């Protein structure tokens, strides 16, 4: 798990 998400970060 990176605990990072572009979709979440941009949302």
């Amino acid at each position, epitope marked *: 798990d*990176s605990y*990072f*998400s*572009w*979709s*979440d970060w*941009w*949302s």
Partner: antibody
Amino acid sequence: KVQLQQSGAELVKPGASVKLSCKASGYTFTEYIIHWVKQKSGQGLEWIGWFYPGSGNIKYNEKFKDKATLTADKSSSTVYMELSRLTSEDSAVYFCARHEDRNYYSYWDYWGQGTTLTVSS
Amino acid sequence: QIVLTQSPALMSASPGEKVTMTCSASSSVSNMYWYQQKPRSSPKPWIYLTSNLASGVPARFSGSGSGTSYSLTISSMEAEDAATYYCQQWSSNPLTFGAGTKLELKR
């Protein structure tokens, strides 16, 4: 082989709607965001929005709020863009591109061949 | 609403010549992304996170900059490098591109 195969060219009357598709293969469909981009007559590029099939989450450019609608079918590895109330301004080539969601060091590493839309009476 | 201004819009170079081209931001951006496009073909990723080359991009290419001023540079021009280059920012929604810098062969 990673590949994004887009739908063929489309000629549509002003005021009608059209539904472009972007079929993905060669990778886990739910791990990558699909961005949509607009280009008129080999000009500059313009970001429309994206759909992440991992969570079902969607985001639009404010400009394309009331123009574009993004949806997906997980069982066919396909993301759709529906364009509504078409004018000559919407005549352009439309590209899809994948972007790994869970990696900060991600870039738009694979692109579709493009779909040409023409709007004319 | 972040506007990216790419200069020059047109430039020419002989093979062997060094090529620098700028992307200028109307506001501050954390990092810049670059793309190469040639006629009748979809754009290709070239640079990501300001100075990191995309997979398969030759070592002669490099990126630089911070805040409001970014640049893409070719140490030694080659014929195959003749294309249009676009910058893009991810810092501020909406995501925005430059108008492009077109690089042509000299003769």
